[PDB]
Amino acid sequence: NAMIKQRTLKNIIRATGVGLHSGEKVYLTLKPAPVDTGIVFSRTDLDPVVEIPARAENVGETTMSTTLVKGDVKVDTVEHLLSAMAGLGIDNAYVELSASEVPIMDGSAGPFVFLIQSAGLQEQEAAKKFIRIKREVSVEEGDKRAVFVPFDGFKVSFEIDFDHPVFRGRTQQASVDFSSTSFVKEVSRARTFGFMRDIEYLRSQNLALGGSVENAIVVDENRVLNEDGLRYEDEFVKHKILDAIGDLYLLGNSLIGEFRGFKSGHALNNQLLRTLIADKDAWEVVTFEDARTAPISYMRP
Ligand SMILES: C[C@@H](O)[C@H](NC(=O)c1ccc(-c2ccc(Br)cc2)cc1)C(=O)NO
Numbered sequence: 001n002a003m004i005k006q007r008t009l010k011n012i013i014r015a016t017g018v019g020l021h022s023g024e025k026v027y028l029t030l031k032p033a034p035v036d037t038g039i040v041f042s043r044t045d046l047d048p049v050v051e052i053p054a055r056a057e058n059v060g061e062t063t064m065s066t067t068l069v070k071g072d073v074k075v076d077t078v079e080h081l082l083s084a085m086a087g088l089g090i091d092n093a094y095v096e097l098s099a100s101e102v103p104i105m106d107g108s109a110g111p112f113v114f115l116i117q118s119a120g121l122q123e124q125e126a127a128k129k130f131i132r133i134k135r136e137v138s139v140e141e142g143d144k145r146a147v148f149v150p151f152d153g154f155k156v157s158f159e160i161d162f163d164h165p166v167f168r169g170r171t172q173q174a175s176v177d178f179s180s181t182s183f184v185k186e187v188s189r190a191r192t193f194g195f196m197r198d199i200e201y202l203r204s205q206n207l208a209l210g211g212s213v214e215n216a217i218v219v220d221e222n223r224v225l226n227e228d229g230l231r232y233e234d235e236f237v238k239h240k241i242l243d244a245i246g247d248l249y250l251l252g253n254s255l256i257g258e259f260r261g262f263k264s265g266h267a268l269n270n271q272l273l274r275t276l277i278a279d280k281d282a283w284e285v286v287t288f289e290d291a292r293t294a295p296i297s298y299m300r301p
């Protein structure tokens, strides 16, 4: 039988861009890593070089993006790159950065999934480990909720709630079941977004210095300002799904289960992970010695 194997990169990937929040120019380098390394961020601009494993315990700030911290060393906005890594089944990789923030690229996981697939994937000689949800686990705060439900595969449901003319109809909720729907085709191209009133407040405080219509959907009181429009009819809720997939990948292993989110953000997503990790009776580590019988499928490398 053919086991589901761990994956890394076949070749080194190089990217350049700007941090959404910092506005700083950053050089990103993706490198192959040995079996059981996981995703590890590396700040190569520092002396000595500081390594931060992409794990729930290393999550610092969770206000507008997911930030990893080790001492006072930070790696900001890891969620879109981790979403791309999770979507393509990359287990092990070194993510080298020349600055404290992952480049925003076009605001989606699209440019990352393209850079990874261009370099190609390398299957490694070790079984891929999955975390299977055995019991329900939920976290709430006010009207926000995030839940893990046992499910034979991988499924993400998300609902947003904006009282705004652009956000009416069935476009405010989406469910993606990865047994029948491609992360690449239906999720990866969904861009980050911001409302003009919030952006004006951020700018007044010298925040979100790298943001523009080139790396985000900008919505005022009545419309989308981007001249070229949306990539999906429900691009906003698909971006929240992209975010949830990246934040969930801080578990350090692919999930076998279902995520449901209602107005959930980076903070509640990480509180859900921390609650699941603490509740050892709600999950177990599984491997698939026969890919045929597996409830999750990855694209060929
Ligand atoms: C969607 C939301 O959860 C979050 N994005 C933001 O908080 C955010 C997105 C864009 C801007 C922004 C866009 C354009 C301009 Br001009 C300035 C800021 C600010 C914050 C996000 O994608 N986190 O991963």
Ligand SMILES: [Zn+2]
Pocket: 079, 080, 192, 239, 243
């Ligand atoms: Zn995002």
